[PDB]
Amino acid sequence: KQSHFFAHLSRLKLINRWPLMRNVRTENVSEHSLQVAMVAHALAAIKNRKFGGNVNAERIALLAMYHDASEVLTGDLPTPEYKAIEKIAQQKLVDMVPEELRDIFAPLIDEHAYSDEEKSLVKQADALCAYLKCLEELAAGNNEFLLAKTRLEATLEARRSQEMDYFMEIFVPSFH
Amino acid sequence: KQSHFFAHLSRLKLINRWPLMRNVRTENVSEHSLQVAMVAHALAAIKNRKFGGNVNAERIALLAMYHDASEVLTGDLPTPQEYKAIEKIAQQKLVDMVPEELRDIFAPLIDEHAYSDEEKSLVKQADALCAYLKCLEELAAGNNEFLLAKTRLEATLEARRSQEMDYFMEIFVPSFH
Numbered sequence: 001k002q003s004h005f006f007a008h009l010s011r012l013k014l015i016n017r018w019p020l021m022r023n024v025r026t027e028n029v030s031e032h033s034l035q036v037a038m039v040a041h042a043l044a045a046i047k048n049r050k051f052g053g054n055v056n057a058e059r060i061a062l063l064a065m066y067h068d069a070s071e072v073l074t075g076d077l078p079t080p081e082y083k084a085i086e087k088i089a090q091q092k093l094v095d096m097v098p099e100e101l102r103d104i105f106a107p108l109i110d111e112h113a114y115s116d117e118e119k120s121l122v123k124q125a126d127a128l129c130a131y132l133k134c135l136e137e138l139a140a141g142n143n144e145f146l147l148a149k150t151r152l153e154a155t156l157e158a159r160r161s162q163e164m165d166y167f168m169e170i171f172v173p174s175f176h
Numbered sequence: 177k178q179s180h181f182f183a184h185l186s187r188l189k190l191i192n193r194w195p196l197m198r199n200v201r202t203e204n205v206s207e208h209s210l211q212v213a214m215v216a217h218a219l220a221a222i223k224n225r226k227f228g229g230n231v232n233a234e235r236i237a238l239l240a241m242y243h244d245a246s247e248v249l250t251g252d253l254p255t256p257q258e259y260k261a262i263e264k265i266a267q268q269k270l271v272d273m274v275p276e277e278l279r280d281i282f283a284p285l286i287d288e289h290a291y292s293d294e295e296k297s298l299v300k301q302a303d304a305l306c307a308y309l310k311c312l313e314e315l316a317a318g319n320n321e322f323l324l325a326k327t328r329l330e331a332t333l334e335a336r337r338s339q340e341m342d343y344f345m346e347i348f349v350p351s352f353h
Contacts, residue, residue: 007351009214010309013207031189034210037241038185045281058234061241065213098347104221132186170275174183 005096005105011072018133020078021148024140027133029068029076035132037064039167040125047121047163060121066108067122069093087112124164127155128172135175181273181282187248194310194325196254200317203310205244205252211309215344216240216302223298223340231294240299242285246270301341304332309352316353 013030041061047053070089077085090110097105107113114122134149156164189206217237223229246266253259267287274282284290291299311326333341 002350003347004351006348030210031206034206049278058238062234062237101225170179171182173178174180
């Protein structure tokens with residue numbers, strides 16, 4: 001009868017990111033995830049408004065909100081077959097959803113269920129938010145994020161798009 | 177041409193909730209908004225799935241995400257009403273920061289203006305639930321400062337009672353210990 005799904009989701013805030021480093025401010029996955037939802041929805045809106053897109057931006061936000069949800073079960077594995085830790089964790093999380101509601105939540109949690117465009121937008125937003133964390137940490141005189149900023153920059157180019165270009169041009173200078 | 181909008185949104189994680197009590201763990205507005213969006217979405221999908229709903233559950237999530245956004249300009253004012261006009265002012269300040277070409281997208285998310293009545297009701301249900309869930313968390317960690325808030329959030333929840341909330345409470349809420 002009773003599901004522990006939301007009980008586990010409530011632990012996202014407990015999972016800390018960037019653990020191999022001194023952080024001026026510790027960022028948890030719940031915070032990261034809201035920021036990614038917000039950036040991803042903006043990328044989607046921009047693509048629709050300016051670059052011919054036909055994206056469900058509200059849907060994109062919701063995917064972004066759940067994208068790192070399995071980490072309540074695994075913790076954060078920092079990136080310098082673990083896609084298999086992740087797949088298992090996502091399934092175990094989806095298995096907690098009552099059967100009659102599970103088809104709602106499965107494509108939110110399971111990244112393999114994302115269309116190629118949805119996953120592109122979500123991963124653009126994730127890299128920008130990671131990059132933006134690097135700038136905030138830099139701006140507060142923390143040089144430990146120098147390296148991370150440089151590879152994030154390689155990632156950002158790899159995931160380059162018109163909507164990212166716009167975002168970077170218009171909203172990112174303000175983070176200095 | 178450069179907007180400070182997202183630079184200000186980034187600050188939501190700096191704003192702390194329940195300021196007048198000792199918290200076992202301090203909850204920020206970013207952590208709250210996410211949990212509200214998750215709850216709001218679930219209350220919308222449940223209504224749709226089991227109780228004859230026709231709501232856009234993704235729209236509802238988005239709104240929930242932005243419901244407290246203006247608090248990056250005002251901070252958090254605990255629950256006691258000209259303070260509504262002041263929140264109205266902070267919102268429009270935030271809206272004014274959006275590039276003109278996107279402002280019609282963002283304006284309705286920040287101001288309680290888009291909101292259809294069912295849509296505003298689901299977000300408020302979710303906000304009350306998440307306030308209540310936090311009271312449960314603190315009580316179960318040994319913190320009696322939250323009893324009183326619990327008692328008054330239960331009256332708020334009765335007042336906002338719905339079928340989909342009844343479902344949520346019965347299935348998902350006892351597990352928070």
